[PDB]
Amino acid sequence: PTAIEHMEPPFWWAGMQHKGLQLMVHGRDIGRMEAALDYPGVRLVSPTRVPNANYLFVDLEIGPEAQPGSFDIVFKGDGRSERYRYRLLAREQGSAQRQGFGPGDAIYQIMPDRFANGDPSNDNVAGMREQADRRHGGGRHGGDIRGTIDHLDYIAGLGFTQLWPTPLVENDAAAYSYHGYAATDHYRIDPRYGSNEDFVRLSTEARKRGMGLIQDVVLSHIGKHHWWMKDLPTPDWINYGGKFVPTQHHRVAVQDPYAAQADSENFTKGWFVEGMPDLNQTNPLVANYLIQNNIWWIEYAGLSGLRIDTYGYSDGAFLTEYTRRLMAEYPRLNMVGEEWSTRVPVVARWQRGKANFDGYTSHLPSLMDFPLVDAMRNALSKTGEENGLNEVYETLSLDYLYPEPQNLVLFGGNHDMARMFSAAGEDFDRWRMNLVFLMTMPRIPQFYSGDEILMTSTVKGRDDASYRRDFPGGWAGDKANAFSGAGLTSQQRAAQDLVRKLANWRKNQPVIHNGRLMHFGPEENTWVYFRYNKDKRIMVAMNNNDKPMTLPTARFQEMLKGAPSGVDFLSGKTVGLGRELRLAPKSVVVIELPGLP
Template sequence: MGIGKRRRVLMGGRLRPTPRHLHRMFVWPRRPRPHKGAVARSPPRPYSPASLGARGVPGAIIMRSIMSPFGRARAAGLATGCAALLFVPALTAAAAPRVQRVEPPGWWAGHSHNPVRLLVTGASLQGASLTGPPGFTVNRVSNSSNGQYLFADLHLPAHAPTGTVPLRVTTPAGETSAAFEILAPRDARANFLGFSPDDVIYLIMIDRFANGDPTNDDPPVSAGLHDRRKARYYHGGDLRGIINRLDYLRDLGVTALWLTPWYDNVNHLNRRETYTANNELSKQGEPITDYHGYGAVDFYAVEERFGDLATLRELVQEARRHGLKVIQDQVANHTGPYHPWATNPPTPPWFHGCPTNHLANTWQTWTIAHTNPPPDKLKATLEGWFINILPDLNQNDPEVSTYLIQNSLWWVGITGLDAVRQDTLPYVPRTHWARWTAALKCAHPNLTILGEMWDGDPKLVSFFQGGQARFDGVDSGIETLFDFPLHYALLDVFARGHSMTRLTDTLAADALYVNPSGLVPFLGLHDTPRFLSEPGATPAGMKLAFTYLFTTRGTPLLYYGDEIGLRGGKDPHNRAPFPGGWPDDPRNAFTADGRTPEQAALHNHVRKLLTLRRELAPLRRGNLVPLHTAHSSHAFARTLGEDTVLVAFNNSARSQLVELDLAPLQLTAVQSWTDRLGRLGNVSVQDHRLRLGLPPHSAALLTPRRAAPLSGVVSGDEATEH
């Protein structure tokens, strides 16, 4: 979810009283009120210190208990009001322990992350101990004073057989057991593959792509949230709908699917985030649903309107069969406002503040990259709640950091994902990202990690790319980022008519990045207005923008529906359903017959570009060499070994003659070039110069005429495989 969008309309979260996936859901008990003068109990067991090293945060935080009383809460940096709300000791009589859930619900023997830190949620867990079956070791057990949480390290034997094992929880008042699954590992040769410039990413908002299972449109557990007439209600898109459209995606030419979050969301309207008819966030507005998935109430469950874990795993495997990778959208910065933790956190410092007493995020991301930022602005950036609503997780609490690391590892391992996209990257301490990426890369070395750093300044964006330690001594390990600077340049040039020097100026800053070829350029996202809804944008300009996007350096990304020119302004209007994804749609743009002439022209252009990108290795892996730049014309070469591809643009309403000096490319035995986009035909070289007569608002993609194909070209049959 984008930073810029959150400045306007950030989505919230939802509460699920009775979800049905993965494991039994905890029914959160109501906390008794303390009598006046109640004395806070001393903590049952201390935590070991954890070195944090974050700027502005103590080097070690010693947490004396999971639910420390008032003094501990204040020591952790929480306001007194939060402590009074959150950390009241339980006053009920002793009862036998009960366990409602264990997180994670299972793990792998022989995993690089061992022991696994369990978060057990239940009741009457004061002073509880936890034991596993023979061969399993449990230590570092800590209990909350209200008896609702227990943390413990569970060491799995290296060769433990797969299957369910019992975990026993014992207190002086009795004992109970909980099931824990020893999971079967996935074949690393066919999973966790990562992505690269050889790929093209396709972003899908699950609720808005295709409805493959109408039975989950309005389930009884969360009835009343489905209404296709309302832009911020559920529309019925689901995982089954994506499975049903994999053939379309393969034919289009994309190779990786980024899905918006599938976390479980709240089962009722979100009345804490409301919008007016003018799309303004206001307490006098109308409530919304969390169809977008960014307001999690359960990090280990799949939203029932999207499907279930079995369907998700089927999707990943079917995508693999179609030659498509899958990228999960994860959120480590915050929860939804209705997450049970918001009013009952597992540890005192689990969040920065509480619903009644917290900072609001001011989105001053420059403070992270500044050597001496204003402390108040830095604090609000790292600890503030988005739109003053979304509870901000405190990753400097070792328990929170470990929970998030394990949650990421669990989703990757349980499904076979190829990459993770992390939402709201700069608002999480870089020390956490260093720990998080180290754990994921240790388990899955080929996994790709993509971060969202929303800013148009490459000096700031480049700071957040991992691969080297910055002035703070931290290498975040985040290997690739969205190329927001190039996004804004593409809009300026191809929608607003600015000089094409905007493109060369933007790429001139590539030296600031550790790996500019690893960036992810894009024309639009689910947080930005659709291209054709930008002032001045035209289908012809969009074709030129696509041509640049799919021929420049990096791993390009395509937002669902952009290939047919869907329109829509700011969120939520940029998230219209894909036409044809629902049985009663008047047109089915998944088929050639169902597209309008404008949609067909754009779709055919994108498909042709992706075919050429797949065939021509220089477009994916080559160096980018600028050859010509003027106000309304531009040309560059992509070179890889002996192979070269030329790309030229005319962004004006008049024909232009563009002359290119090819001498710096040191090409030999190339006398003519062929325009693979079909506008120019064959063009001859004279004295190392190539003269191109480009029609208005057109581009040419030229390859040398040779007897043998480029080494990056594959046969026609191979070109249909992904």
């Protein structure tokens, strides 16, 4: 095999917070060599050997005195010599202080294969294992970075300020490569999406249009076609010695006073599925590898933050160290973990600042708010319930369990669950209530591409393909084009208009970003809440019934303080508030009022 086949990370930076840098070098008999270098400020620590002759780990300490530049690392032995020109880049100004996504932002989520096909010629790349098939629900359809860049003005125009694509890193599988969650090369964009440089350009073009770029990272597992699997770096690189042993998904076992170690180990070491080998993050070489790789992406691509897949499936102690390291580099960053639970205590456990019964500590800033999303979907779909909205109110009342509930990501939907419009029973009026809720809660809102034109799916069970249909207009020849509005129905257009109206409005509402929330217990499926501060009040009121409802306003006086009326932002009409609030069937109002003293 090639001289040096992989050098990882391939370059680094001067002036990082953490001085240490561990290079993973791969090439035939490279482990039989000895490394050497000469550069002021950089110290070579000295080999800690591994049994595999095809890998060498090189431990560097990059002092604060080390300057941007480059130097040769020279590997000598077996009467031969290999070189690698190592570069230490200068950091962009303000790099460490970069502002992560937060309450003022709204995130638009895409799956890059399913959004826009800007270059059909990369749909297939010579040498790769899967051929594209737009007619297969689990196939590659051909979306790419060019297509995403082409439509950044659309996304910004809709009122979004962050872009979250599901993973773009190489997934060279024979089938189901499209989704990105089984990496085969952590340091390379899948060529079907474009180049590493194209991904950097995506970040720079998004930034020009006022948008941050949030990368989707998997830490727990890889794809079985990862080049590591051909020649395991160490016998314990992959959990269970590289052999498939399935997890049974007992997520509470890592945070349960009654837990069996068998179940905790099975959660964090168990293979998610057979095609997804599980990384042993208890091996410090694996821990360092992932930590450095994610830092490399943030620094190289100028990311505003990360979304961290399958969060608790990684080793707990690794997660503590990983979050500490990432947040030490980038103190203002945001990272949002995916803890798939509808139980607030389960999600809350992972957030930075939480006092845990077992002393578990974390620097993770954010989690996906599955409990609150589930609650609202139940309320809007179970329309025969007298007071289904009570589930939302009670779930929200548990916010004290989170150190920073305002930093959680609330979403209309995502690529793993029923389409937002379908979850609302294709009821446009109830869908409006969900959208208003999303845009007014004390959360960071996230929206899934395609929901703005009411794309539908199955609702029963798990049906990935139905949640991931191509965006209309992303492909040459499409009869309808949501980017231009061509071929949309009046209802689809009304949806898109409302998203654009609300998201753009939200950008300019500090009271939503950091004001207080006071909500009232729902009664007969009507719900009133306020966002407030001394400058502004926003009153949201929902009537989740197919009959009109009238709410005496005496109930709300600690918020209304005698306000006789206010203008509803949705309709532009003045709404009476002096003695009663008259709500039409299936209505929602967003009443804007002066400050609360």
